[model samples]
Target: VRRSQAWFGRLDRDGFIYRSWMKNRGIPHDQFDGRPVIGICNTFSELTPCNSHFRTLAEQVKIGVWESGGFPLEFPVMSLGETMLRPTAMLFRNLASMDVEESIRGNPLDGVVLLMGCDKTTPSLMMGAASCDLPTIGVSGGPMLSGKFRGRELGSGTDVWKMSEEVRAGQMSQEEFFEAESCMHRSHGHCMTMGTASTMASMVEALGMSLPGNAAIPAVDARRNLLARASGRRIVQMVKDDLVMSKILTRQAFENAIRVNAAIGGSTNAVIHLLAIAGRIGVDLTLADWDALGHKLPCLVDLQPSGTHLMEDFYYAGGVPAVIRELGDVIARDALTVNGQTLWDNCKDAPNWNREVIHAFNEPFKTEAGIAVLRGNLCPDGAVIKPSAATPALLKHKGRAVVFENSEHMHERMDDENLDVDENCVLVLKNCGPRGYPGMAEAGNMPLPPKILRKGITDMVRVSDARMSGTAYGTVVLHVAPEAAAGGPLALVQDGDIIELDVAARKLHLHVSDEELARRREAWQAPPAPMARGWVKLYVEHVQQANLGADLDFLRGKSGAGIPKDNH
Candidate 1:
């Protein structure tokens, strides 16, 4: 018997209560007669602009569920808007996962269709559902159409960073900058660039969590609507076949995801999210796995921060399947997908229509493009850098330290023309890691001082415990583990200190004596918690460092889909 039968198939008063409430919505009594119940886990909110179109997608999912002999029920979960959310959207990601986990467990759900897009929703939903180990399918709301400006295509976040810097540097007029904003987002979707949102969409496809070609389909495209319906159909059949989440989310699946992430020049943010998801699914994945598995792959996609094209061009070039098809043997060919075919079977013959957009492995767009994990005295546990997005000249350099004690301090001093800094200096930001910022925001790609920008200097080496947006680019070293807030060595560096960044050597070194660092540690007093009460307080207390995926300590393993027994 299905797990949902306990609620809908009981013969007592509880059965009548369950069936009667749903019947008021015009669902016939027979609709509750042992048919599979597929929960449409929706993260749609007008505030979450990237996912505002999800309601229509949910309706289409219902149509497919009914077609496949399942009863579909839609439910709400907290929506995270990376643009509008204060502090950071990441602050509430774990909270939103709790909403998803409990909603799935407490309801009469036999299977789930996760409707997620935007940056945090994808990872949070997947993490929550993996805990339940149910038959699940994911439908990503696709990226927006490519932005157009003065007959030249704009790559969303990539251009936003470029144009804003231009405006600040007195190179572009404010009025022209304002006009480009409208041109950049004229459609309903997440970022068109391979920013965090678009990167996570591709990640789901590579992880075998979503259908093939689920990543690049533009939100306004009719094909995405069709994919949503197909996803809905597949989840119902998966429930009937007893195909659960664990079967598809094997260790091999995660290895494939990491390889694909490096190949696509995906976000460093993916490292945190994939680790959290793997933890909940009982996988023994470590940062070492990321370091080892991240090798032998060169970036193949020519998208945004890494290259010129946007996701729309990627779709036209046959999307991720083409890239995976080009990857001959590195991919685990026999890993199962939700569609019951091996991962290789689904994409073996996938054709690449444009070689420029999706390059062949031998003639890749960029070599030395995979994520390079750095380990040194500065980041003892681990830190990561995306080589594809970095300036080649800045990768191996030693420079003077220009320290920002905290984010507010940086804000006050960064734009001041009188600030004493040079192009060769490395910017060090402290107190903004998982516990420090209390949300670990995407702020590591520190802007160049106006002085530096005025001198025609574009990129600089930056070190921080925080994260950088996948859409942003630079020679930024981020996610320093054992963050400053944890009384790590990062808390000891003083202004004017020397620092070195060598990407090829995978080293982030702070040139300070152990005696000096120890003395500094003694003088350092821990700052008070960001919050004294509520979710932020709890999160600050339990959230692990970046090296461990920044997940709450207690939420590391699965609890299955079991729920509390009803008592009256």
Candidate 2:
């Protein structure tokens, strides 16, 4: 990590190697010595419309880097847009993480700035940078200003899921749906709901990974760019201070984030991504941590998918820092952040402008609100429930299993006229785990059957081995590792199986005997190959269970940023 003459390991040979590479990039030798080389890891692509504005955003970051006397180099990484991806953006999350990991590892980056947008992009880049444990900072493409539809403000992912269901149920007109669509995503940032994008932003801040107030700024706001430039200026300072990811993402910092995630009623997608980031940094996190730390932190922010306000209102009222200011006692205030200040130092004098959006500790948005971790024979490995977004009654329901073997199976049969499901049935999805879906698609948050939606049932209890978009909500139990395809308890489930979900006790049990389950396991076969070659194959062969953050078994832990052995 010593920058002094370290790059000159081979002396004359070092000068030749460095100069040759710079010539290829059209840079002069003077730029190499004594100047910080800040790599701008940009996750921008036309396909990822949410981040299509990064060409301009990168300029702002570069301006700051140059103003602060550093060499700014913007490099591209694979983008995963939740709206455009097939199977699920989650399927490509780890793959993109590899892209970020390798690109950073292979480059001569003195410090790194993560330019992230969209849902999976946030985690993919953060996890990658974290593995290197260098001086790093996260700059989010802020949430778009609230969408105006039919004179009512719209929350991004939360409304899309709600309206799409309404369309299938015939509750809304076709013309109205099309018109609302254009109005929904009127600007550039990520989803404005408490979806994966917003959740990951929270993850960045809570883990002391980002500068304060980086999470809820509106995309069109001029201040968001200011934050980017400030981050650029701070990264150089970070290099001077030697603040690394492992130092910021400590065990105590993780616990603070888990509680904050609960306090915000954060996306369930955070569960998998956080677990993966923890894996990359070797933070001793486990499923039990979610239950013990996250499940009890009360929901404080009144955002969509859980509450009414959009992210814009959140920023206007007082963003995530306001939430942190209130939960200071519950969090590790002394944890270090990328900005060279402790978590509390960043928010010592934080103001709460509006109590409506960010409520007080005594009179919070929701009491006992957080992601409730459930466990039972049904999901012996464990599952998550967003009690803040779920119907209170359905939280503790015992219902008949209405099974869908895969997303295609569910899509085909869920709307059939003779489909024998009702409002009381629990929808179970299988064959969509890390190994099963090949990439462990986000199919766990199963859309309600058209028949039930037509009957005005807006939510249901769903249990699956797969993950789900953080934008989605229900009494769903997701990330059931040892997935059904892997012969965990979920594989033995039958249509008539009596399953009980007691979320209060954090339990999800199947009413079946172990001997009968053993019989079924012996007769069952693995799902068909989901991947054949390339990254997918590498992922399938090495990806661990969901509890381990679904990261590649070999990619865990810090490889350090020390210079590797020179190639002859």
Candidate 3:
């Protein structure tokens, strides 16, 4: 018996209701003759411009579903806009997961095709679908075309930050900055800098949840639409074979993703999102696992913020499948994918079209390229830094603390004529962690003081309880656990205190002794909640720390697909 039979197999009033309503859409009787039902879980919204093209993409999936003899239905989930959303897009990640989980479980679907793009959408959809343990496949909307500006290539968030700094330092005019803005995002798609959006798309492919070449196709590329249709066709067969997400997203699959993330120089955000996904699927994952699996893996993809190239370059270099082949010995070659083949079997023969963009293992793009997990008194629980995107000189430096109570405090005085700061100071931002920012906003890569920037000091050792955009580059440490809002040591820090960051030793230390730290803690008062009531309030109360993936306290484990009670 099929799962879709629950709704379409009945010969009584219930079957008539289900069949009659769908008949209005021109679906014939044989179409409901126990064939699989595929739900197209689409995250499409104009506000989320990266995913705005999904309406057309969904039609492509429907065609595949029909060709595969499966009944298809499309549904919407909350769309998170990283650029337009208030507070932070990370704030609503779990909420969106909940929307996806319920929408799938509450519907009559035997299989699902997840249409995801933007950073949070991918992980949230995967997390939600994992909870139901259905036969599911993913289709990324894909990165935008390569950006061009004044004869030079532009990368999305990378250029935005660079030009904004130039304007602040008086090296570039405001008019010039505006001129580059339109050129940076001349097409429709997510950031093209191997930012969280592109990284998560790679994560989907690496985890074996998507078809081959799903990670790097440009949004405007006809190949992305073809992949969407293929994904739809695959899910129907997956249902017929009883291939659920639990079968595909094994521990081996998660490990494969970690190794691949390192090889591709993926975003540090991948660590948190992957941990959350593993948790949903009941896999054993931790912050330490990131270092253990990826710390030593050499980066192969030449992408911006880490290298000089962009996603389009990596795509032309044969994309993720090529990187997978390059890391052959390091990955979990036996991991199974949605196509019911081992990962190695899927990409063993994949060709690398370009040498520069997809480097060989012996000749990598960067060495020791992975997310490093750090620990010390300042971050008692944990912290992370991306060595691939950092200034090597500042990785193991000692600098005096220039503390900012929050983003507002940092912004108001960061440009002051007499602000107490220089290149040698460590920029410490507080009260912006999971509960503190109530969203763990991407404010960790604090901007350099305009005065210092004008002096040609481009980067400093920055620390925060918040996160940094994967698109940003600097000697930055992020996701300080037991974050400031929870009364961690980051909140006890004061101006001029010495802060030492030794990425080599995996240490982030505040130079205060235990006695002095205790004295400061006695005077420390927790920041007030950002909201009195609503989803934000609920999230703030139950969201875990950054080290724990910032998922809800009660949403850790899976809730399998057991048929629901009768609605009548």
TM-score of each: 0.99, 0.96, 0.99
- Stretch of 10 with least lDDT, candidate 3: 559-568
Which candidate achieves the best lDDT against the true structure? 3
lDDT of 1 by residue, 333-388 (tens): 99998888878998999988999999889999999698888989999999888889
Kindly report which residue stretches of model 1 are placed more than 4 angstroms away from their true locations once superposed.
none
* Candidates 1 and 2, the one with greater TM-score: 1
Residue 248, candidate 2: Cα error in Å is: 0.7
> What tens-digit string does per-residue lDDT give for candidate 3 at 1-568?
7767888888888888877988996878988898999999889999998999999999999999899888889999999889988789999999999999998888888898999998788888998999999899999998898889889999989888888888888999999899876788978788898899998998998999999999998999989899998888888999999899998888989888999998888888998999899989999988888888888888888888898899988898899999899888888898998898988899999999898988899999889888789999998888999988888889889999988988889899788889888888998999999998779999988878998999986899999999988899888889998999998889988999999999889899999999998988898888777787999989998999999889999888899777787677
Backbone Cα, N, C clashes tallied per candidate: 0, 3, 0
The parts of candidate 2 lying over 4 Å away from their true place are 1-11, 20-28
lDDT of 2 by residue, 1-568 (tens): 4442345333577657755766785776666666777889998899997888887778888988888878778899899888898767777888888788787767777788998879889989988988887889999998887989878987787787788888889998777878887798888888888888997888898888888999999778898899898898888877777787878989988888888888788988788888899888888988889889876777888987889988888888778888888887877888888887888888767888888888887888988878877777777677777888888898889999988887778788887889888888888888788887767776777778888887888888898888877777778788886888777888878898878888888878888897998888888987766657777778777888887788888878767676765555
Better of 1 and 2 by lDDT: 1
